[PDB]
Symmetry: C2
Subunit: 173 residues, 2 copies
Amino acid sequence: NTIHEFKKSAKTTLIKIDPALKIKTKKVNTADQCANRCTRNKGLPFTCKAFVFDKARKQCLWFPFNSMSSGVKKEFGHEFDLYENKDYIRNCIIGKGRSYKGTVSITKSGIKCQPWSSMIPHEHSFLPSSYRGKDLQENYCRNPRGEEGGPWCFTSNPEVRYEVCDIPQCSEV
Amino acid sequence: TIHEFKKSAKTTLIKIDPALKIKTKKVNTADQCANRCTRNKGLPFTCKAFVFDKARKQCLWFPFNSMSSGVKKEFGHEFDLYENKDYIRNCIIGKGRSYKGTVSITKSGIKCQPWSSMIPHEHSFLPSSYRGKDLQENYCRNPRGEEGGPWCFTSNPEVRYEVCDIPQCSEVE
Ligand SMILES: O=S(=O)(O)CCN1CCN(CCS(=O)(=O)O)CC1
C-alpha cells in the first residue's frame, strides 16, 4: 500500500492539451489499487509520474506526466483526486525556491510545519487564496514571496512563529 | 516506512564538521529507526538519513546524507545506511553522470535489469569495474555520461538497454 507515498491534490484531474501525450485507464475498486500499479509501473507502456482516482466512475487514470508538465492542465472535479509520484517532483531548490513544490514539511531545527490553512498556533495572512500558483498546501515548506532565506513555514511550536527549512540547492559548486 | 529510503549495505557515514548534529539510540530493528526518521520525532534537526548498527542494535540519525559536503562514506560489515529519498536529487544535471536516485523503470515503462544480473542481457557494467558510479540494484545510471541520460539494461529480452525518463533539473521553472 504505497498511496501515502504520493503528493495528493483533492478535486483535481489532469487534461492533456497535446493530443500526442499518452494515458492509460482502468476500472478498479479503490485508489490504493491505482497507487500500487503506478509504484510498480506494471503493465504501463510509459513511466508513471502521476495518477488520478475517479471516485464516481471507479477508475484509475495513469499518466506519463504530472501537473507541472508541458502540454497538460489541471481540471476541477469533485469526483477526482490527483496523486503525483514524488520521484518526478523536483526535490531540490532552484534559486530561492520560489518554484519549490516538494513535500518537505519540517523546519531546519526539526519542527513540524503548521498548515498554511491554519491560524494555530500562528495567526497569519499567507492564505492559499492570496497566493495562487505558490502551492500553499498542507504544511509544506514554501517561499511564496521569493525571500532570500529560501522555503520556510510557520511552525507547530507556539514559541517559534516561523523558521526556514533545510532543502538543498539543486546545483551550487 | 523503511522503503522510503535508499539502502546502502555494509556502509556508514562520518562527519568532518563537528558542528553537525547527530542523535543515537539503542533500538531493536532498522524498521524502528526508519519510523523515527520518517516521523522526525524528538530529533532537533531534519532527518535525512540514518545508519543501523546491526551488532549494537543502535540507530544513528543524521541531518546529512552521503552527498553532503564533509561526510565520509565508510565500509563496515555491521552497518547499513538508509538515505531519505526526499534528499537525494531526483533530477539530472548535464547528462546525469552524478544521478544517484532510485528510479528503476525505462522511458517505455520496462523494469530495469539488475547491474549484477547477466539475465536476460549479458554485459560488462559491473559495480567492481565502475567504483563510485553506484551501479547497485537495478537503478537507472549514466556511468559514462552518455547522451540520453541515465539508462539501464532492460528486463525485456527484446530490448537490451533503454534510457529512463529522469527529468532535467531545468525542465520545470
Ligand atoms: O511571521 S510574519 O507573518 O509576521 C511575516 C512572514 N515572514 C516574513 C519574514 N520571513 C523571512 C523570510 S525567510 O527567511 O523565512 O525565508 C518569512 C516569514
